[PDB]
Design an enzyme around this catalytic site. Sequence first.
Site, mmCIF file in Angstrom:
data_model
loop_
_atom_site.group_PDB
_atom_site.id
_atom_site.type_symbol
_atom_site.label_atom_id
_atom_site.label_comp_id
_atom_site.label_asym_id
_atom_site.label_seq_id
_atom_site.Cartn_x
_atom_site.Cartn_y
_atom_site.Cartn_z
ATOM 1 N N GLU A 114 2.140 7.474 -0.840
ATOM 2 C CA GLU A 114 0.779 8.002 -1.047
ATOM 3 C C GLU A 114 0.732 9.475 -0.573
ATOM 4 O O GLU A 114 1.428 9.853 0.391
ATOM 5 C CB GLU A 114 -0.264 7.201 -0.229
ATOM 6 C CG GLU A 114 -1.696 7.704 -0.378
ATOM 7 C CD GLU A 114 -2.748 6.704 0.088
ATOM 8 O OE1 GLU A 114 -2.394 5.521 0.347
ATOM 9 O OE2 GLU A 114 -3.934 7.067 0.165
ATOM 10 N N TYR B 43 2.248 -1.710 0.522
ATOM 11 C CA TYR B 43 0.829 -1.736 0.239
ATOM 12 C C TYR B 43 0.485 -2.908 -0.669
ATOM 13 O O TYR B 43 1.314 -3.394 -1.437
ATOM 14 C CB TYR B 43 0.475 -0.379 -0.439
ATOM 15 C CG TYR B 43 -0.913 -0.322 -1.047
ATOM 16 C CD1 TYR B 43 -2.010 0.058 -0.271
ATOM 17 C CD2 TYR B 43 -1.134 -0.647 -2.401
ATOM 18 C CE1 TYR B 43 -3.286 0.122 -0.825
ATOM 19 C CE2 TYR B 43 -2.403 -0.590 -2.946
ATOM 20 C CZ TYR B 43 -3.477 -0.198 -2.157
ATOM 21 O OH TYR B 43 -4.753 -0.105 -2.714
ATOM 22 N N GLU C 79 -7.247 -5.153 1.586
ATOM 23 C CA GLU C 79 -6.317 -4.100 1.164
ATOM 24 C C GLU C 79 -5.439 -3.886 2.381
ATOM 25 O O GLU C 79 -5.952 -3.796 3.500
ATOM 26 C CB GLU C 79 -7.082 -2.814 0.799
ATOM 27 C CG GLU C 79 -6.189 -1.679 0.291
ATOM 28 C CD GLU C 79 -6.979 -0.399 -0.025
ATOM 29 O OE1 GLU C 79 -7.932 -0.105 0.703
ATOM 30 O OE2 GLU C 79 -6.607 0.328 -0.993
ATOM 31 N N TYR D 179 -1.694 -2.187 4.469
ATOM 32 C CA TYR D 179 -0.634 -1.200 4.548
ATOM 33 C C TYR D 179 0.261 -1.503 5.721
ATOM 34 O O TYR D 179 -0.238 -1.765 6.839
ATOM 35 C CB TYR D 179 -1.201 0.216 4.864
ATOM 36 C CG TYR D 179 -1.915 0.974 3.782
ATOM 37 C CD1 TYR D 179 -1.215 1.950 3.057
ATOM 38 C CD2 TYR D 179 -3.285 0.802 3.543
ATOM 39 C CE1 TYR D 179 -1.863 2.746 2.155
ATOM 40 C CE2 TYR D 179 -3.937 1.580 2.634
ATOM 41 C CZ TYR D 179 -3.204 2.562 1.957
ATOM 42 O OH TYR D 179 -3.865 3.408 1.054
ATOM 43 N N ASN E 234 -5.841 12.768 -3.867
ATOM 44 C CA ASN E 234 -5.226 11.474 -3.476
ATOM 45 C C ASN E 234 -4.366 10.932 -4.619
ATOM 46 O O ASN E 234 -4.855 10.818 -5.740
ATOM 47 C CB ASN E 234 -6.312 10.452 -3.142
ATOM 48 C CG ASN E 234 -5.776 9.241 -2.332
ATOM 49 O OD1 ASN E 234 -4.752 9.343 -1.640
ATOM 50 N ND2 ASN E 234 -6.483 8.125 -2.406
#
Length: 206
Positions: free
Chosen positions: A184, A85, A94, A96, A45
């Site tokens: 990402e 993000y 959080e 997105y 990641n």
Amino acid sequence: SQITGNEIGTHDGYDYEFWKDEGGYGSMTLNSGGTFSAEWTDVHNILFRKGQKFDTTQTHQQLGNINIDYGVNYQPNGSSYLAVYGWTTDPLVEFYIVDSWGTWRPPGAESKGTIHVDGGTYEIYETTRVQQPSIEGTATFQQYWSVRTDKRTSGTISVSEHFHAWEAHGMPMGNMYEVALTVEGWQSSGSADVYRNNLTIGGLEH
């Protein structure tokens, strides 16, 4: 290959971050304003981003109309997201807003509805992250998503409109901590050249 390891800082008016966990490698080159190029190879990641961090004393309505005018030569080879993000605090959230992706369109949840904005259609999702890392340490928090129904790699993302729609769908937002155009990578390789990334608030530089 300028940045090749976890680093957080400011460059030419923007807050940037290179972050990855173990495995493979990545490279980020910081360019003017909000621009940067990224390259990644066999990572688990990785996240590359440039944007703005805030003091956490204002809601997005108090900040004003947030927009990002962007363009990315996006070439993922495997799973990846091109998204705005960020985070809010109190509540810790959080989020997105995804305009493009690689081989998998996120996030694997049941849609809570749609948002027509910036000429496209987005589906809204909410997932819970249990005892996961966060800007406030190990924590349990919600993760909000707006995901375009088709891929797009340039245009304007009217960030504030997504924020208003999440609240209208019963997903509250806290005070703003960060908003940033992000690339990402997940179990993949790829390249992304973010050649345009202009973040404005009320039409002005932050």
